[PDB]
Amino acid sequence: IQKAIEENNNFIKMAKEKLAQKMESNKENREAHLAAMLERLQEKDKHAEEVRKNKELKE
Amino acid sequence: MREIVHIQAGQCGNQIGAKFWEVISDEHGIDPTGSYHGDSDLQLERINVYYNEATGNKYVPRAILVDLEPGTMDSVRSGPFGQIFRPDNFVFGQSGAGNNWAKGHYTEGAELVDSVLDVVRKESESCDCLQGFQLTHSLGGGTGSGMGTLLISKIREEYPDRIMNTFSVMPSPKVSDTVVEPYNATLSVHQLVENTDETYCIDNEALYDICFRTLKLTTPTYGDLNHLVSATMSGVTTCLRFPGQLNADLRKLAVNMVPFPRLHFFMPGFAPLLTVPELTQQMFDSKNMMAACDPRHGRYLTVAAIFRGRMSMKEVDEQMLNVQNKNSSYFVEWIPNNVKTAVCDIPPRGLKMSATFIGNSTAIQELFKRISEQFTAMFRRKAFLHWYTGEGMDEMEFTEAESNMNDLVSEYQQYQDATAD
Amino acid sequence: MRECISIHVGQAGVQIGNACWELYCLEHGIQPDGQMPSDKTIGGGDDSFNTFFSETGAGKHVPRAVFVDLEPTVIDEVRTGTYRQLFHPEQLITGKEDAANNYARGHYTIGKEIIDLVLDRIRKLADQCTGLQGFLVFHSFGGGTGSGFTSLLMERLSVDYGKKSKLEFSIYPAPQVSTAVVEPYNSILTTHTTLEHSDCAFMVDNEAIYDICRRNLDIERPTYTNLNRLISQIVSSITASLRFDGALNVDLTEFQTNLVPYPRIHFPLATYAPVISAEKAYHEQLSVAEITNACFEPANQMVKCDPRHGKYMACCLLYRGDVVPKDVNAAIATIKTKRSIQFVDWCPTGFKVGINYQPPTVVPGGDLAKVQRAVCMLSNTTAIAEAWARLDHKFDLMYAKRAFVHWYVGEGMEEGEFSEAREDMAALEKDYEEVGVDSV
Ligand SMILES: COc1cc2cc(c1Cl)N(C)C(=O)C[C@H](OC(=O)C(C)C)[C@]1(C)O[C@H]1[C@@H](C)[C@@H]1C[C@@](O)(NC(=O)O1)[C@H](OC)/C=C\C=C(\C)C2
Ligand SMILES: Nc1nc2c(ncn2[C@@H]2O[C@H](COP(=O)(O)OP(=O)(O)OP(=O)(O)O)[C@@H](O)[C@H]2O)c(=O)[nH]1
Ligand SMILES: Nc1nc2c(ncn2[C@@H]2O[C@H](COP(=O)(O)OP(=O)(O)O)[C@@H](O)[C@H]2O)c(=O)[nH]1
Ligand SMILES: [Ca+2]
Ligand SMILES: [Mg+2]
């Protein structure tokens, strides 16, 4: 009966830990995908500044 | 509900944009005042996707009208269903783009975009659950092309987890005599391939050839071309507007239609321009595509087809299998069951039954190759380049857009030649 | 006691819940308002139907069920339907944005926003139980919620309820009514993730149900409504042993002992008889022998496969209605001397039999003829691995090119989860092959 308790607890434990790792791993990956997207959008805004600057330095 | 925020930019965007709102207003049974006078409850079950409900059962289009010149604004406001649009959602400049992509994207448009974003944010924040945006514009001009692609980038920065859809009208010498349009188109495609999730490629070449060769309309007016666009735009949104199981929203459509993120350019089709067999055969025929491409010159990655009207649903299933079986070579085998069929039992105006087609075909490269053919000849000439560099643009930004479109074509070719084993 | 809590996830789970709970109400004489005149113990009881219905002081019999969907239009039909009074509003849980046929959105992006609220409402039902037996989970394989959110729920249920039994009714995708090209991906992902957390799963192949509706009920284009009323009959036969009492009644848990020889081999094949139209049932009585022999015609199976090319590891017959053991034994003796019935060599060949005297029931205006006797066979056959093989092949075709995978990676998943899930399916296919080999 001590083994049955142990094995029941080990299944709950491994399920709890396996899930917590996935949600943490998934949060990082999704955020990192969103961060890379904004950075690419943010570097086209910086490019537009260089373009508008270049029109003012044309006259 | 799941609201879509509509945006129409430039002349082309506002022209086809207004007709789109005219057609679906009638299909949902609302008058140019905004009151409902219909007969079927299906018209109102999913009305909030495109309309804001105001006090007194007044339905107001969730639409934002944009242009760098105030001309088109008076046309829409005076045209039918002009008094239904929200006055505050009109955002017009005075300068005018003059078919300069740089003006729309970097100079003139960059100074109006913020007052547009204020209207986008105000509409968005009032959405129960915003699903995304749909933009109507052309790629050959300057405002709809240059500013249209600026707004998309700006909106994506604040709503990166939403779907960005566009109805992009592709330039053709058969309709517009402007010669620089392949510059604006190439520069736009460089942006649409990066910042949109679904683009309906409305090709003026196909619209012209249809009116001239099938409808026998020598000297076709813009009204004739836009009647096809309006019927098409009504068809490819039926699944969003009426109760349905299949591609009921913008995200579920993208998941079914886009196997690779860059390959998100659809060629739509419509029928008639009847029996279920020949409705199905027409919609898969090259003459009924709204993009000047032959689908039998490539393979279908995915296909969405919606039938409208009262018809035998057993027959639609039987005939969609028949077309897939007799054209098995034209559907990629490494995507099982890539053709999806929807059926909405409320037909369009005038037709007892119709069929709309949405194909992700590798034959779309034929359209991008046409633009590239014009663009490449203009670039060697270095014809009309000072107007772009005059606004601060570089010569590399032209080269980069060219090579990105070459990659898009070769990527569409890669998967056309790919096999299962 | 021995209460069972039903959890209906996604459109398929919800819409199948409507059919099942409507059918249960008609079987027990429960009205749409929850009143049950025949039930004289007001406010509680220990009767067999109390395993699935709780009782309020006002005499209302309330399903021990939770409905969950990450979008509100399917559950709205329950909230405004014929049986809206049957459920407490807290049993009907909806989000605002569905999973868009994406396992990642159902398990992570959208599911994590509502998983805690759902578990709280399930806990609220469980605390009303004096002897909770386990859970029944209804969901599709193809949808983003049915796949993604279900596997999240099953993981969380294993943490909060340990090894309490968890049963699945899983809708296996078919192209005739498919809604997404990526349903093979969601199928493999949810099967891999739930495998460790489910004790027994009854797969229902939509193509199997679709074909039966066309051939046996003369339905030209079967709808979800046609399919669900047939599915609810199979579900009602399987749960009948929990909801009714009787001398020859055998509890589903006793069958479970026989049906699951190893933990991963917990996918029984269901076969129901008779599926016949009123037009055809007229002046035609289906005897015990006829409906029993029909259980070994592959055309009547809930999953497309050929048991004649497999081996049996268990065979259970769940009769209901006018059936006496005598006729069962005669029908079985005939079948054993005429069919392609082969057991593995490490298991006895005897058929386990259960009889519930409560006759089959049909919903008004339904396509099934009302018959005096029905039977649902639950068998554990290696042949069911053919269903895995078909799903895995379609998965492989798309995953070789990474088609649509970017929709999943964008929501936080990694390609390692696809390969891990597919490797598990390959081990499962080998498992079903190994159990079929003869002993040395
Ligand atoms: C005497 O010969 C010609 C004289 C003109 C044009 C042509 C020929 Cl040949 N050709 C070949 C064309 O194809 C037309 C086209 O312009 C058109 O859009 C249209 C209004 C004509 C254009 C210049 O390539 C377009 C952009 C570079 C655009 C031009 C502009 O619109 N503004 C701007 O910044 O850039 C500008 O000022 C308002 C007016 C028009 C220009 C002038 C130069 C006439
Ligand atoms: N048998 C059956 N299958 C159904 C039914 N409704 C949907 N399905 C199947 O469910 C799968 C698609 O998932 P759905 O149930 O539609 O949706 P969901 O589970 O809520 O998931 P989302 O798409 O994320 O909303 C496909 O295999 C459909 O055929 C139904 O009433 N009966
Ligand atoms: N089909 C169609 N094309 C249009 C319409 N208006 C403009 N276009 C196309 O748009 C291109 C020029 O861009 P336009 O929209 O006129 O100008 P913009 O506002 O400066 O972008 C040409 O290829 C035209 O054919 C219209 O109403 N219908
Ligand atoms: Ca009682
Ligand atoms: Mg759903």
- Say if residue B270 is in the same domain as residue B318: yes
Going from the Cα of B245 to the center of ligand 2, the distance in angstroms, rounded, reads: 9
For residues C253 and C277, state if they share a domain.
no
Side-chain half-sphere CA neighbours of C73 within 13 A: 11
Q: Resolution, in Å, please?
A: 3.2
Task: Kindly state if the Cβ of C55 falls inside 6 Å of ligand 2.
Answer: no
Question: What number of C-beta contacts closer than 8 Å exist between B and C?
Answer: 74
CATH number at residue B208: 3.40.50.1440
Same domain, C263 and C281: no
Q: Kindly report the nearest CA distance between residue B190 and chain C, in angstroms.
A: 20
Nearest atom in ligand 2 to C231's CA: 1
Same domain, B221 and B80: yes
Residues B158, B252, single domain; the answer is yes
If asked whether residues C236 and C188 sit together in one domain, one would say yes
CB atoms under 10 Å from CB of C232, counted, come to: 21
**Of the residues C268, C302, C328, the one at which a domain ends:** C268
> Are residues B387 and B355 both part of a single domain?
no
Residue of B nearest to A57 (CA): B392
- Which residues have a Cβ under 8 Å from the Cβ of B245 and sit 6 or more positions away? B342, C179
The reply to whether B286 and B158 lie within a common domain is: no
Residues B293 and B329 in one domain: yes
Residues C78 and C200 in one domain: yes
Nearest to C108 among A8, A15, A23 (CB): A23
CA proximity to C7, closest of C230, C109, C188, C160: C160
Tell me which residue has its CA closest to atom 30 in ligand 2.
Answer: C12
Q: Which positions in chain A touch C152 (Cβ < 8 Å)? A: 19
For the question of residue C254 being annotated catalytic, the response is: yes
Name the CA radius of gyration of chain A, rounded: 26
- Is B280 a pocket residue for ligand 3 (Cβ < 6 Å)? no
Alpha carbon distances (Å) from B282 to B140, B229, B303, B305: 29, 17, 15, 12
Residues C304 and C392 in one domain: no
C249 annotated to a ligand binding site: no
Q: Are residues C432 and C351 in the same domain?
A: no
> Which structural domain, as residue segments, surrounds residue B295?
260-363
Nearest to A8 among C108, C163, C414 (CB): C163
Interface test with C, best of B315, B337, B339, B417 (most C CBs within 10 A): B337
How far apart CA B106 and CA B168 sit, in angstroms, is 20
Please, which chains are in contact with B (at least 3 CB pairs closer than 8 A)?
Answer: A, C
Contact B201, B266 (CB under 8 A): yes
Does ligand 2 come within 6 angstroms of the Cβ of C101? Answer: yes
Please count the structural domains in chain C.
3
C406-427 burial by CB neighbour count: b if 16+ within 10 A, else e?
A: ebbbbbbbeeebbeebbebbee
> C391 touching B, CB under 8 A?
no
- Rounded distance between C-alpha atoms, residue B344 and residue B347, angstroms: 7
Interface of B with A (CB under 8 A): 102, 105-107, 110, 153, 156-157, 160-161, 194-195, 390-394
Residue C205 contacts residue C387 (beta carbons within 8 Å)? yes
- Which of A11, A24, A37 to mutate to probe the C interface, most C CBs <10 Å? A11
* From A16, A22, A30, residue closest to C411, measured CB to CB: A30
CATH number reported for the structural domain that contains residue B327 in this entry: 3.30.1330.20
Quick one: DSSP state of residue B146? Answer: I
Do B204 and B335 belong together in one domain?
no
Q: What is the CATH number of the domain that holds B385?
A: 1.10.287.600
- Domain shared by C262 and C283, yes or no: no
CB B142 within 8 A of CB B104: yes
The response to whether C228 counts as a known ligand-binding position is yes
CB of C181 within 6 A of ligand 2: the answer is no
- The ligand with the least distance to the CA atom of C142 is 2
Is-contact C165 C135, C-beta < 8 A?
A: yes
Q: Rounded distance, CA B412 to CA C200, Å?
A: 45
Question: Rounded distance, CA B125 to CA C331, Å?
Answer: 68
- Measured by CA distance, the residue closest to atom 14 of ligand 1 is B178
Test A51 with B156 for CB contact under 8 angstroms: no
Which residue out of B12, B100, B386 has the highest number of ligand 1 atoms within 8 Å of its CB and is therefore the one to mutate? B100
C112 closest CB neighbour out of A8, A11, A23 = A23
φ/ψ bin of B349: left (φ > 0), alpha (ψ from -120 to 50), beta (otherwise): beta
Does C258 share its domain with C375?
no
E strand or H helix that includes residue B307? strand B300-309
Task: Check whether residue C43 and residue C142 sit in a common domain.
Answer: yes
Residues B247 and B297 in one domain: no
**What is the rounded distance in angstroms from the CA atom of residue B164 to the CA atom of residue B5?**
10
Among the listed residues C145, C104, C268, C134, the one whose alpha carbon sits nearest the alpha carbon of residue C197: C134
- C151 CB near ligand 2 (under 6 Å): no
Residue numbers in C near B415 (CB within 8 A) = 401
Q: Are C162 and A8 an interchain contact pair (Cβ–Cβ within 8 Å)? A: yes
Decide the pairing of beta strands B90-92 and B63-67. parallel
Domain boundary among B323, B344, B363: B363
Among B313, B344, B363, the domain-final residue is B363
Find the ligand nearest to C170 CA.
2
- For residue A11, give the nearest of C152, C156, C158 by CB distance: C158
Asked whether residue B167 falls in the same domain as residue B309, the answer is no
Q: Is the CB of C409 under 6 A from ligand 2?
A: no
Is the preceding omega at residue C175 within 30 degrees of 0, hence cis?
Answer: no
- Residues 6 or more apart in contact with residue B167 via CB below 8 angstroms: B16, B134, B135, B136, B137, B199, B200, B202, B229, B233
| C407 in Cβ contact with C144 (< 8 Å) | no
- Domain end point (choices C268, C300, C335): C268
Mutation choice for A interface testing from B101, B153, B192, B398 by most A CBs within 10 A = B153
Helix, coil or strand: residue B275: coil
Q: Considering only CA atoms, which residue is closest to atom 14 of ligand 2?
A: C143
Neighbours of B88 (CB within 10 A): 11
In terms of domains, do B278 and B396 share one? no
Q: For residue C439, give its domain range.
A: 384-440
Distance between CA atoms of residues B226 and B228, nearest Å? 5
Q: Which residues of chain B neighbour A36 with C-beta distances below 8 Å?
A: none
C-alpha distances in Å from residue B135, one per residue of C177, C351, C390: 32, 64, 41
Task: Look at residues C235, C268, C301 and tell me which one is the last residue of a structural domain.
Answer: C268
User: CA-to-CA distance for C156 and B311, rounded, in angstroms?
Assistant: 46
Contact A55 B392 (CB under 8 A): yes
Domain at C400, CATH number: 1.10.287.600
Catalytic position from the list C254, C279, C414, C423:
C254
Tell me if C126 sits within 8 A of C135, measured CB to CB: no
Measured in Å, residue C15 CA sits from the centre of ligand 2 at 9
Q: What's the burial of C248, exposed, middle or buried (CB within 10 Å: 0-12/13-18/19+)?
A: middle
The C-alpha angle with vertex B73 and arms to B270 and B202, in degrees rounded to 5, equals 20
Experimental method: X-ray
B8 lines ligand 3 (CB under 6 A): no
User: To the nearest whole angstrom, how far is the Cα of B59 from the nearest Cα of chain C?
Assistant: 21
Within this chain, do residues C392 and C293 fall inside the same structural domain, yes or no? no
Distance CA C197, CA C137 (A): 12
The answer to whether residues C108 and C145 belong to one domain is yes
Domain with C334 in it: what CATH number? 3.30.1330.20
Nearest CA in chain B to A53: B392
Q: Is B392 left (phi over 0), alpha (psi -120 to 50) or beta?
A: left
Same-domain check for residues C273 and C307: yes
Structural domain count of chain B: 3
Cβ(C405) – ligand 2 distance below 6 Å: no
**Which residue type, as a one-letter code, is found at position C101?**
N
CA–chain centroid gap for B86, Å, is: 22
Helix (H, G, I), strand (E, B) or coil at B271: strand
In this structure, the answer to whether residues B178 and B314 fall within a common structural domain is no
Same-domain pairing of B93 and B119: yes
Q: Which chains have 3 or more CB–CB distances shorter than 8 Å to chain A?
A: B, C
For chain C, list the contacting chains (3+ Cβ pairs, <8 Å): A, B
**For residue C106, which atom of ligand 2 is closest to its CA?**
24
* Contact B278/C at CB under 8 A: no
Q: Which residues of A touch C197 (CB under 8 A)?
A: 15
Q: Of B237, B259, B281, which one is at a domain's C-terminal end? A: B259
Could you give the CA distance from residue B353 to residue B271 in angstroms, rounded to a whole number? Answer: 9
Ligand (nearest to CA of B393): 1
Nearest-5° Cα angle at B381, B378 to B383: 70
